[PDB]
Task: inverse folding
RNA sequence: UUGUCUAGCGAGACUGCUAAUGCAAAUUGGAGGAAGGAAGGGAUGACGUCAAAUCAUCAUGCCCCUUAUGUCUAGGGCUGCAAACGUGCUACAAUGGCCAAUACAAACAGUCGCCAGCUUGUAAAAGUGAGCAAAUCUGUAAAGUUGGUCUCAGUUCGGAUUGAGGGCUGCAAUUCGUCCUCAUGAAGUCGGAAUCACUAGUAAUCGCGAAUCAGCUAUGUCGCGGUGAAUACGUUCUCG
RNA sequence: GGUACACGAAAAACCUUACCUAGACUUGACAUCCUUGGCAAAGUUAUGGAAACAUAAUGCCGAGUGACAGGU
C-alpha cells in the first residue's frame, strides 16, 4: 500500500530504531532526505516554484 | 576538424639547460610525480658519470643522434585493406618517440636497481647495440616494399 | 557604560538582503551611542545538495541546489540603553534572526 | 612444527617459513625473547634453535594448531549446523553473495552452456 | 624601506618583504630554510629563477610568509612576490622581464567537477 | 525535458515566497512542512476566488500568513463572512496557541498573474466548455489588458481518443534564455470526464530596465 | 554476540525454558526465536522453530551451544549447481 | 617574523589602439595590462524525434477487489547459483613492500550532537573530561623528504578464503552489519578477439569533508584539496 | 542497444517492502459526511503469548449509528 505506510510512520513504536524518515506531504523513503524531513522529488518540485525560503539553484 | 592549435613549450632545466633532458623528465615521469622521477634522473646522471666516466652530456646527445629516426609509419586503405607506408615527421616528435623507445626498453629490463639498468640501456644505445636502434632499423627497412605508396601519399 | 558586551549576531540566508539589514541596523544605531566597531565580514555557510532529477533510471542526470546562510557580528562593550530603544523603531525583516548572550 | 631456515638471510624470517606463526607473531616472539635479526646472517648463537622452539611450543604446536582447527571444522560438520553444513560442501558461509564469486573454493572454472534465448 | 609584494598560486598566497639594507639576504620561509620547508630537491633553483637570471641576490633581504596550498603553488607565489618587488623597485626592467613570461600566475587551478565526471572532464566510461 | 523559468530567476531577481529561518533540521522541517500545506490550502479550497498569492512570514515562533487576491469582495465576506471561516481554518491547520492573523489586499496590476488566467481556463475545462472559445478569449483578454507578448499551451484529452494533439500559442517575445524578464509561469491540471488536462501559461509582466536589486 | 551478555537471548525463551526444564519430559517446545542462543543451563532439548514456511523441530547439541539456534538449521531452501 | 584574510560595493578588456586587407563584416602580429580576441569555467536545452521511462512520487479515465489486493506483529525474502555481462578495488612490484623520524591546506559539518584531552589497552574501544548552537573547540592529508631493511624472487609482493579471540551500535548481527588482534596464505608474471575515456591543471596518482543511516565490506555518491604529464601532423577511413 | 544494467532503490538484520507462512482484522489500522459528549486519549504492569493483542489503575478531551475508505 501507500497511505497506510504513512499512517504507521506517524505512529510511535516501542523500540527506538523502528523509526524511518520520510516526507509528510509527499513521502518517499526510497532515497530519503532527512536534511529537512523532505523527499527528493518533493524538494525538487517545491524549489521550482520557490516554496523553500533558503532554496537556490546551485552556483559555484 | 581540428583547425589549428600550438602545443605547450618546455622550459630550460635549472641545472642542465637542455630541452633533451626536459623530454627525458617528461618521458620517464609516472603518476604525476616529479621528485621520484627526479631521483631516477639524478641517479642516472651520477651513474653514467660513475661507471666508465665520460661526460653525461657527450654520451647523452651522442645516443640522441644515433637514435634519430628517418621515416614514421602511417596507414592508408582502399576501404578494405590496410597498407602501411612511412612519411616524414618533424624533429621534435622524432626525439620524443626516440626517448620514449629508450624509456620503454628501459622499463622492460630484469636487473635489480632501476638506476643501473637505465644507465645500461643508455650506454647500449650509445654503443649502437641497444634495442632502441633495432626498431629504427626496422622502420628504415620496411620502406623497401612500402615504396609503392610511399611514392604517392594520400 | 550601561550594558557591557552587546555581542549581537544576525543571521540571514542571503548576501544582498544581508547587506540591506546590516546597513539598516548599523546606521540606525548611529545617532544615539558612541564607540561602535565596524561589522566584521563573515564567511558564508554554503551547502550544495545534489539531487536526482528523473524519478527513474539515471545517476548521471542529477541537478543540484544551493542553500547559503550568512551572519554578521556587532560587538558593543561601552553603550547605553539608547541603542536598545533604537532597536524598536525600524524592524529587521522576517528572514533575519538574532543571537545574543 | 619443523626445522626451516631461509637461504641466507636474517633469523626472524625463518619464523615466516614456518606455519602458525606469521609476521605478527614473529615480531611477538622477537620482543618476547629480546632477539633481533642481525644483518643477513642466520647464525649468531647455537642455543637459540631450541630456545625459540620452547616459546613457540609454549604458544601452541604448529601441526597441532592446524590439527585442532581441522577438528573444529569437522565439529561443525558432525552436528547439524548451517555454518558447518555450508562449510563442508565447498561453499561460502559468511555475508558474501554466491552469484558472481567464491571461485577460489570452486576450481578455476566449470562453465557450461546457458539458455539466454527465451 | 621594505617592498610590499604579494604572490598568488593554486589558491595559496605569499607576502614578501625586501629591504635595501647592507645585507645580501638569506632565502627563508616559515622560519626555516627552503632546503627544509620546501622539498630538498630541484625546486631550490626553481624558486629563484628570476633572481638568478636578473638582479643577482646581493642587495635585498628575504622576508616571505606563505598561506595555504601545497608546496609547488607556494613556490609560484613566492616567485610572484619576488617579481612584484623587482618591478616596484626597478620598473625599468619591466621590458626585459615580461619576455621571460614571469608575470602573474595563469589561474591554472583544479576545476570544479560535476556529476557524471571523475576529473571534471573524465566520462563515466560509456558502454554499449 | 525543460524546467520552469520561475526558478531560473528565483534567488537572483524573484522575491521569496517565505522569508524565515531557524535551527537546522530541528524545527525548520516541521515549520516548513506546516506552512507549505498552509500555502497550498487556498487554491485547492477555492476556485472562484482569483487569489493572487499567499505569503508566509515567521519571526522566532511568531507566524502569520498574508493573502493577496484580485478582488476581495468574495474574500472579505459580508460582516466578515469569509474572515471568520479563514480564522477557523487557520486555527485548524497550524496549532492553537500560535499567533494567527492576516489581511487581504490587492497587488498592483493584478491582471498580470498567470494563476488567475490558468484558473479561468481550468474553469473553462471543468465546465465542459469548448477549447477554441477559451483560447481565443484568453488571447484577446491578454492583448487588450496591456502587456508584452505572452504564451500558453495545453495538453490532454480534447474530446477524442488516442491523445496525440497538443496546442501551443505564443505572441511577442518570450525569452526563456534571459536572466532579467520578470515573467510569471503557471501550471494547472483540470479534471474532466475523460481524464486530466495540463495547461501551462507564461504571462509577460515585462522586462524592467536595469534591475540591480530585488523588487 | 554481545560481549556484555555471553549469548543474548530475547528473554522470552526464559519463560519457555523455566516451564520446560521443570517439566523436562516433553522435548518439543512451541517457541521460536532465530536470534536465541542457549546457555549451558538451557541445553538438551528440541526446538520447534518456524522457518516462515514450516515448524521444524530439531534437537540441539550438548558441546558447543554458543551459536544461534537458527544457525543449527537451514534458514531457507537451496538447490544444486544450476543446470536447469 | 600583523593588514595577507574573510566580503560587500565597485573599477577593470570594451577588437579599446596600431601595422596588416578588406565594399563591409571580419583576419593575423605588436604595445599594454591581471588577463586579447566567446580571460577560464560552471548555470541557462528551440520545434520535434524514438508513443523510450514512470497509471509504484503525486493527481489521475477504465475495469476489478471489497468481513478484503484493508489492517498488526512475529518470522523468512528482495543477498542463493554451473555461468556471463556491466562497474570498481587491488595485485602481478625494488617508481616498489615494510620500519623510525620529519614539510604543508581547502572547504565542510558538528546540540540527545562535534568530540580537545586524561587513564586503561597490540586493538575495535571503554571510564572520564574542555570548548563548540559554531573565524576562539573538534576532525594524524598523503603523496614528499632523511634514511634503514627487503636484493630481484611467486619475494616482509599480492592479500582472498577460512579459523580463533577481542570491539561497537543495534530488542537483536543466523539469514544478510561491521571494526580490530592473531592463524593460514587463493589464483596470480600486465590480461589475446575488442575496445572505452581524455587538449594542462588535462590524464594519471595521493588524501580530506558531506550524504542516507542507531550503526554499516558504500572500493560506490557528492564534492574539496595536493603532486601533476603526452600528443595534437592530419580528415583518406571510422561515429554523429 | 545508442536512449537499462555503481539503476530506480542517498542504506533489504523490526521498519525499509510490494512478497512465503503464522495470529488476529471488518460502515473498518487511518480519515471524512450525521447525532450525542468538554476530560480522559495515550503509556504502566505481573495475565496468556514467538508476536499482535484482553483483563488493573493511571493519565480538540470523546460513544453508537449510518455515510465507506483504501489497492506497491
Result:
Amino acid at each position: 500500500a501507500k497511505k497506510s505506510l504513512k499512517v504507521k510512520q506517524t505512529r510511535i513504536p516501542k523500540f527506538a530504531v523502528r523509526a524511518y524518515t520520510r516526507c509528510q506531504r509527499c513521502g518517499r523513503a526510497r532515497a530519503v532526505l532527512s536534511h529537512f524531513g523532505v523527499c527528493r522529488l518533493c524538494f525538487r518540485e517545491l524549489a521550482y516554484a520557490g516554496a523553500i525560503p533558503g532554496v537556490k539553484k546551485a552556483s559555484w | 576538424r581540428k583547425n589549428r592549435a600550438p602545443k605547450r613549450t618546455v622550459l630550460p632545466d635549472p641545472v642542465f639547460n637542455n630541452t633533451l633532458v626536459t623530454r627525458i623528465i617528461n618521458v620517464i615521469m609516472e603518476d604525476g610525480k616529479k621528485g621520484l622521477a627526479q631521483r631516477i634522473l639524478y641517479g642516472a646522471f651520477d651513474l653514467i658519470e660513475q661507471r666508465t666516466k665520460e661526460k653525461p652530456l657527450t654520451v647523452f646527445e651522442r645516443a640522441v643522434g644515433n637514435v634519430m629516426p628517418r621515416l614514421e609509419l602511417r596507414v592508408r586503405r582502399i576501404a578494405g585493406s590496410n597498407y602501411q607506408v612511412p612519411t616524414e615527421v618533424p624533429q621534435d616528435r622524432k626525439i620524443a618517440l626516440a626517448l620514449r623507445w629508450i624509456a620503454m626498453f628501459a622499463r622492460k629490463r630484469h636487473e635489480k636497481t632501476m638506476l643501473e639498468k637505465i644507465a645500461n640501456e643508455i650506454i647500449d644505445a650509445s654503443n649502437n647495440t641497444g634495442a632502441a636502434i633495432k626498431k629504427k632499423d626496422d622502420t628504415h627497412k620496411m620502406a623497401e616494399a612500402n615504396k609503392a605508396f610511399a611514392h604517392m601519399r594520400w | 557604560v550601561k550594558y557591557p558586551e552587546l555581542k549581537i549576531k544576525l543571521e540571514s540566508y542571503d548576501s544582498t538582503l544581508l547587506d540591506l539589514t546590516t546597513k539598516k541596523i548599523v546606521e540606525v544605531v548611529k545617532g544615539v551611542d558612541v564607540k561602535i566597531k565596524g561589522p566584521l565580514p563573515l564567511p558564508t555557510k554554503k551547502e550544495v545538495i545534489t539531487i536526482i532529477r528523473s524519478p527513474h533510471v539515471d545517476k548521471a542526470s542529477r541537478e543540484q541546489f544551493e542553500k547559503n546562510r550568512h551572519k554578521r557580528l556587532m560587538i558593543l562593550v561601552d553603550v547605553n540603553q539608547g541603542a536598545i530603544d533604537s532597536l524598536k523603531r525600524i524592524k529587521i525583516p522576517v528572514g533575519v534572526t538574532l543571537r545574543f548572550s | 612444527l619443523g626445522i626451516d631456515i631461509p637461504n641466507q638471510k636474517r633469523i626472524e624470517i625463518a619464523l615466516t617459513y614456518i606455519f602458525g606463526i606469521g609476521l605478527s607473531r614473529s615480531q611477538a616472539i622477537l620482543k618476547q625473547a629480546n632477539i633481533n635479526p642481525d644483518k643477513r646472517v642466520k647464525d649468531l648463537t647455537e642455543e637459540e634453535f631450541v630456545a625459540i622452539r620452547n616459546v613457540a611450543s609454549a604458544y601452541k604446536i604448529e601441526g597441532d594448531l592446524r590439527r585442532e582447527i581441522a577438528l573444529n571444522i569437522k565439529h561443525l560438520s558432525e552436528i547439524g549446523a548451517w555454518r558447518g553444513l555450508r562449510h563442508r560442501k565447498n561453499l561460502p558461509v559468511r555475508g558474501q553473495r554466491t552469484r558472481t564469486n567464491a571461485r577460489t573454493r570452486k576450481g578455476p572454472r566449470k562453465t557450461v552452456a546457458n539458455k539466454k534465448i527465451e | 624601506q621594505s617592498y610590499y609584494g604579494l604572490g598568488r598560486r593554486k589558491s595559496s598566497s605569499a607576502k614578501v618583504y625586501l629591504t635595501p639594507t647592507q645585507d645580501k639576504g638569506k632565502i627563508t620561509v616559515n622560519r626555516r630554510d627552503p632546503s627544509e620547508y620546501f622539498p630538498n630537491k630541484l625546486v631550490i633553483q626553481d624558486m629563484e629563477q628570476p633572481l638568478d637570471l636578473t638582479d643577482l641576490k646581493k642587495n635585498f633581504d628575504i622576508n616571505v610568509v606563505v598561506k595555504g596550498g601545497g608546496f609547488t603553488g607556494q613556490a609560484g607565489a613566492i616567485r610572484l612576490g619576488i617579481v612584484r618587488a623587482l618591478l616596484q623597485f626597478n620598473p625599468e626592467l619591466k621590458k626585459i622581464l615580461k619576455s621571460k613570461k614571469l608575470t602573474t600566475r595563469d589561474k591554472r587551478v583544479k576545476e570544479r567537477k560535476k556529476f557524471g565526471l571523475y576529473g571534471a572532464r573524465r566520462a563515466p566510461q560509456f558502454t554499449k | 525535458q525543460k524546467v520552469n523559468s520561475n526558478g531560473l530567476r528565483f534567488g537572483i531577481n524573484k522575491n521569496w515566497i517565505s522569508r524565515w529561518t531557524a535551527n537546522s533540521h530541528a524545527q525548520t522541517a516541521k515549520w516548513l512542512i506546516e506552512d507549505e500545506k498552509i500555502r497550498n490550502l487556498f487554491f485547492v479550497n477555492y476556485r472562484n476566488a482569483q487569489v493572487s498569492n499567499v505569503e508566509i512570514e515567521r519571526t522566532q515562533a511568531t507566524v502569520d500568513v498574508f493573502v493577496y487576491a484580485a478582488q476581495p469582495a468574495f474574500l472579505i465576506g459580508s460582516e466578515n463572512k469569509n474572515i471568520q471561516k479563514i480564522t477557523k481554518q487557520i486555527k485548524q491547520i497550524i496549532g492553537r496557541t500560535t499567533n494567527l492573523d492576516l489581511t487581504i489586499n490587492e497587488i498592483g496590476s493584478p491582471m498580470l498573474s498567470a494563476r488567475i488566467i490558468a484558473r479561468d481556463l481550468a474553469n473553462a475545462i471543468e465546465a465542459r466548455v469548448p477549447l477554441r472559445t477559451a483560447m481565443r478569449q484568453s488571447l484577446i483578454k491578454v492583448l487588450k489588458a496591456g502587456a508584452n507578448g505572452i504564451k500558453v499551451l495545453v495538453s490532454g484529452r480534447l474530446n477524442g481518443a488516442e491523445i496525440a494533439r497538443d496546442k501551443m500559442y505564443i505572441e511577442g517575445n518570450m525569452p526563456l534564455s534571459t536572466l532579467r524578464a520578470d515573467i510569471d509561469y503557471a501550471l494547472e491540471k483540470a479534471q474532466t470526464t475523460y481524464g486530466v488536462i495540463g495547461v501551462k501559461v507564461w504571462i509577460n509582466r515585462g522586462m524592467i530596465y536595469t534591475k540591480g536589486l530585488n523588487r | 554476540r554481545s560481549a556484555k551478555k555471553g549469548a543474548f537471548v530475547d528473554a522470552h525463551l526464559l519463560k519457555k525454558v523455566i516451564d520446560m526444564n521443570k517439566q523436562e519430559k516433553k522435548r518439543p517446545i512451541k517457541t521460536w526465536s532465530r536470534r536465541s542462543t542457549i546457555f549451558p543451563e538451557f541445553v538438551g532439548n528440541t526446538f520447534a522453530v518456524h522457518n516462515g514456511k514450516t515448524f521444524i523441530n530439531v534437537y540441539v547439541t550438548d558441546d558447543m551451544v554458543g551459536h544461534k539456534l537458527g544457525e543449527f538449521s537451514p534458514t531457507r531452501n537451496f538447490k544444486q549447481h544450476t543446470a536447469n
Remarks:
- The interface with chain C takes residues 31, 35, 40-41, 43-44, 47, 53-59 of chain A (CB under 8 Å).
- The beta strands of chain A are 32-33, 38-39, 56-57.
- The longest strand of chain A covers residues 32-33.
- Residues 13 and 21 of chain A are 13 Å apart (CA to CA).
